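Regression test attached.
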Amino acid sequence: GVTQTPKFQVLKTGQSMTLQCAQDMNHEYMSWYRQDPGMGLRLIHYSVGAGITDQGEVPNGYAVSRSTTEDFPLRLLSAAPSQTSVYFCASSQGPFQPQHFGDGTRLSILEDLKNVFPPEVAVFEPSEAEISHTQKATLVCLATGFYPDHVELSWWVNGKEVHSGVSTDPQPLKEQPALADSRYALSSRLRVSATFWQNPRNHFRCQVQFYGLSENDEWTQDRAKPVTQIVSAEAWGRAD
Amino acid sequence: DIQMTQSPSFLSASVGDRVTITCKASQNVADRVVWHQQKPGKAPKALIYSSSHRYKGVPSRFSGSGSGTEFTLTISSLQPEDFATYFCQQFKSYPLTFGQGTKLEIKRTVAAPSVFIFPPSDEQLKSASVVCLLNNFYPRKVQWKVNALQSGNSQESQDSKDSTYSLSSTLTADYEKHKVYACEVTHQGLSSPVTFNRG
Amino acid sequence: QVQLVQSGAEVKKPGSSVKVSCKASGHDFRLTYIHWVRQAPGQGLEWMGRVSAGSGNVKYNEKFKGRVTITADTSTSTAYMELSSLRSEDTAVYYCAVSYYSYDVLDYWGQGTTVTVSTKGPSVFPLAGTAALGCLVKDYFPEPVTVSWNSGALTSGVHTFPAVLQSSGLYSLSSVVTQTYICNVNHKPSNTKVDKK
Amino acid sequence: EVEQDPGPLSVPEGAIVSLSCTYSNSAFQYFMWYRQYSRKGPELLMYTYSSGNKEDGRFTAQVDKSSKYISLFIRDSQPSDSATYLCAMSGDLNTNAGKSTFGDGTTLTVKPNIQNPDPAVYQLRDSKSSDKSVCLFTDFDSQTAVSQSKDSDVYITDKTVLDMRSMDFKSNSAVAWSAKSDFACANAFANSIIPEDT
């Protein structure tokens, strides 16, 4: 379809960065949008063909280029707080034709990287009363104290990702909502049958993938550098 | 910190010609320069950011290029409202530094001046100052006699119509001790030094 | 749309303080960085500070050490600038400019507040092919002054020269034009308008 | 900007939902309908190049160029249809140079039909360590609303729906936890309750 990378990122103010977006569909028309609350999808740049690009509705602070029909990178000249947005690449057969959008790049510009911090993951075993009352067991997994909101939470039972019975909160909670850059917490629950929980051979792993600092960056602050990592907490089936 | 020495200082040009200005750097500033336009006595407005990219609304005539320590601005096919001081700024490192500027006036052929000598006023004399006017001459030296070349007191200060400078040079117990006060100016259109009394 | 206004015109003799506002409209104030630059008559352009509106984070130029102060008022969405212990040569148009689209890029500017480092009124003296004639003089503080031809009936042929700063430190200028002919001199702060033949 | 569609909308599960946008001050020709879930990009649902109707499964897109009115009809809507729906129009050489122009979007919430509600609050202990306790308010009817935390120490998540697809069972849930000791299992959810089991 339309592959764009990366899905999450943190970069310091004043830094330059290219957002990669490539398509195999041989489409002629490509465009870059930014999506904001209260502003809708606003067009940054668009390219009608190889070697031709033009400004959109909000082009200032960005730059693109179309060397080949297949690709359409988008540059940030100097990262500014106004550039914290969600960026969508799109391709189309023409200016009139419908566009098909990429998955999305969630961007976060920060003045100071000692506010980027990894999460803490904990799994809470189902209540003994819930099993006896509903014959279902709900495990709740908490990802707490992470900044910014670049996380992907998955549920792995016996080392295989599951989707049935999984509910993940759509948006995180502000742990200290009075803060302009408050850390977040996120909760999700996996509901299984009571018999499934009471099979001790059942391995329940709640894994959160956090996108933080790259090794290209500089970490002066004391504790461990907030590099992109996977943080998971594991629970085991309990017969009683 | 960075020193942005700007060239060609201040140039004249006619409309609709590929006229360019340059901005040299002292340290490496990569592509982190901004070209600004300021009208003669108004709010400046940014034109080119990151050394090559126009803001939305900037006409296609304004182009910037260069990288590292050598940066150029081009206004190819100049146009009347694109007639004012232009300066370059860097945003590599704090503190921000700018250029002195490059004002752009209208080029014309040599325009002969119009020298007028104005006697002082008795109302003023009741409190004198002779006045010389170099009305409407192009391009942009005056010496005064009261025959003594008194030096240390005198002071001086594009018209909207035909690109002609008007120039005024004023002189400032010895006035009535002398009889002849002849103005004197030098220029090219007036090839030779073209130069009243008491009553 | 987006705009900036920088305070009323201040005037101070040496040895005081001064505060200049800079009202920012347009986009979200917190995502903006407000920079202050000054430029003296016949001089280069001098950056002397900036503030992060959304974080209160301030960096000033080193040559105005302890002398400039920038504050971001996130509620009323204006930026202040406090030059204190006014040196003799703090005479310039002081500009506030905001980098919003790109960091440190100074996307747009304000009109320009004027601070110059008492008050007195002027006088006008007549100056008896072409026979030009002009009003002139005398000495005034502070600026500005305006002159018009017969209350504004001719713009071609009248040449009014920018004010010069004489030895005493108070300005005077020449206003000439190239039938009844009268200047209309006007001076704002001293309540002085003289229309002399 | 020249597109016109409003914000929030909620419909019970199993009902027909109608969405719409209008575009007066424009002569558009081609009309799309995108669907955007959280943390992903818009997905193309329908596209038409004329006044008329087009149907694909539970979806039906209509265009009335005479009334400058287009509408999307989801029928037998399920909770999985809860997303943000964007209309978009093209083909007008006098608006946006013919390019696509999007409405700011309509938010849809298909509330699950909770047959046999069983509201209750359970306290859950951690698997290994950390001495923390979450509280699970679950199995309540979708008509029940979960209020935000009014205390700075404690916090509560908005109600969320999980589908045990194996047995065609849906159930809303919300969790609450804190470190201050004066909060317990029966405390966190003292906001808009019915008779549960504790």
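Expected vs. actual: identical. Chain C is about 0% helix and 40% strand.
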